[PDB]
Paper text:
We identified two macrocyclic peptides, GN13 and [name], that antagonize the active and inactive states of Gαs, respectively.
To explore how [name] favors Gαs/GDP and inhibits GDP dissociation, we solved a structure of the Gαs/GDP/[name] complex. Four well-defined water molecules and a number of intramolecular H-bonds constructed a helical secondary structure in [name]. One molecule of [name] binds to the switch II/α3 pocket in Gαs through electrostatic interactions, H-bonds, and hydrophobic interactions. Specifically, the side chain of [name] R6 forms a salt bridge with Gαs E268, and this ion pair is stabilized by Gαs N271; the main chain carbonyl oxygen of [name] A9 forms an H-bond network with Gαs S275 and N279; and the main chain of D229 and the side chain of R231 and W234 in Gαs coordinate a complex H-bond network with I3, W8, N11, L12, C14, and D-tyrosine in [name]. However, [name] binding induces a significant conformational shift at the Gβγ-binding surface by expanding the switch II/α3 pocket. Instead, [name] phenocopies the effects of Gβγ GDI activity, stabilizing the conformations of switch I, III, and the P loop in the GDP-bound state. Such a conformational lock not only orients Gαs R201 and E50 to directly capture the β-phosphate of GDP, but also inhibits the spontaneously Ras/Helical domain separation by stabilizing H-bonds between Gαs R201 and N98.
Numbering used by the authors:
A (entry chain A): 38 to 70, 88 to 352, 355 to 394
B (entry chain E): 1 to 15
The structure:
């Protein structure tokens, strides 16, 4: 029984832990046996509404409540923002929902790329009344949307067609500088995950570096590290659903953040899905080609790009089936010449 | 002290 160690890399919030959770759904017991719980969904709900409310005053220009009657709801939300051991009483759900229906709050949500907001904000805020029920058991999709910070390595071990896989994410791990290279030991392939839709956002670590440029810089560092030169990279251009939504909305144009997009044309090898808007096709291949330029500019490793939606179990099932074929057939490239 | 992956990847000071 061959075992393949698969190392998930990528910037924070690109989708690495979601891929692990998807592997567990597909090939282990899902969220059934430190898994994401109801409480994490309530915490995300609270973090979303309190982040949006607090951001209203700080934007330039600032955003006001559309309904000044909701001011006491704002006072409540900000007052419990950092409360340890929040009990989520019924008035919290009342104020959160009523604030989510305030046009000023939504206008602030629409400008979320100007601050730091978790991805699942609208998804959870739109089902406040479902979540607050005492009988509420979260669906797998609820648990996939729930952003939970990993402490330590986040991993899954599973067997498919008599082939063992060990997929692990080191996003929540820290190590001594000279020992970090050891995390790549005996790795069959790196799975590099990119939040394609985050081209208009900046990273939390400094609130200045553009998120996509951060992903390109990370990918460049891995790709050109001579001690990793024999490890092939499977590239997950993730959050395709959020990329399509953002492009079709025209609020943040890609060329406003990556000016060469204005001169980019969709390649002729492109396989746009039927019905895909041409702007979305050009965007997603541009982002792909931003990484492919790095991997072509400089060994015994290749890059295999994939368009993915990490919260879509069926999408990841398909993509991972392609990866297993890529993974089980990577050894064949060792026998090729030139 | 201990550094993150990006501190390693970009040779940033631990801080
Ligand atoms: N709409 C959408 N949301 C995603 C996708 N992938 C991740 N999300 C979310 O993005 C958030 C952060 O993803 P996570 O796996 O925790 O990022 P990590 O820091 O790289 O592990 C989670 O709320 C995930 O549900 C995607 O493909 N589409
Ligand atoms: Cl990213």
């Amino acid at each position: 029984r061959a075992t393949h160690r698969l190392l998930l890399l990528g910037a924070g919030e690109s989708g690495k832990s979601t891929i692990v959770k998807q592997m567990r759904i597909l090939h282990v017991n899902g969220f059934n046996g430190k898994a994401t719980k109801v409480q994490d969904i309530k915490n995300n709900l609270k973090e979303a509404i309190e982040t949006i409310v607090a951001a209203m005053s700080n934007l330039v220009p600032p955003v006001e409540l559309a309904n000044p009657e909701n001011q006491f709801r704002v006072d409540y939300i900000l007052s419990v923002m950092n409360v340890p051991d929040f009990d989520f009483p019924p008035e919290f759900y009342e104020h959160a929902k009523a604030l989510w229906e305030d046009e000023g709050v939504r206008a602030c949500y629409e400008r979320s790329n100007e601050y730091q907001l978790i991805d699942c904000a609208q998804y959870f805020l739109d089902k406040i009344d479902v979540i607050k029920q005492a009988d509420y058991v979260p669906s797998d999709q609820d648990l996939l949307r729930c952003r939970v910070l990993t402490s330590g390595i986040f991993e899954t071990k599973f067997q498919v067609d008599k082939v063992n896989f060990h997929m692990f994410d080191v996003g929540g791990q820290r190590d001594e500088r000279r020992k970090w290279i050891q995390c790549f030991n005996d790795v069959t392939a790196i799975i590099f995950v990119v939040a394609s839709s985050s081209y208009n956002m900046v990273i939390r670590e400094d609130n200045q570096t553009n998120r996509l440029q951060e992903a390109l810089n990370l990918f460049k560092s891995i790709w050109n590290n001579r001690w990793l030169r024999t490890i092939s990279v499977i590239l997950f251009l993730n959050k395709q659903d959020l990329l399509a939504e953002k492009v079709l909305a025209g609020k943040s144009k890609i060329e406003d953040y990556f000016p060469e997009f204005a001169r980019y044309t969709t390649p002729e090898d492109a396989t746009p899905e039927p019905g895909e808007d041409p702007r979305v096709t050009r965007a997603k291949y541009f982002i792909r080609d931003e990484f492919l330029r790095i991997s072509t500019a400089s060994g015994r490793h290749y890059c295999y790009p994939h368009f993915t939606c990490a919260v879509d179990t069926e999408n990841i099932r398909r993509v991972f089936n392609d990866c297993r074929d890529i993974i089980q057939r990577m050894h064949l490239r060792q026998y090729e010449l030139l | 002290x201990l550094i993150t992956f990006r501190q390693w990847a970009f040779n940033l000071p631990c801080g």
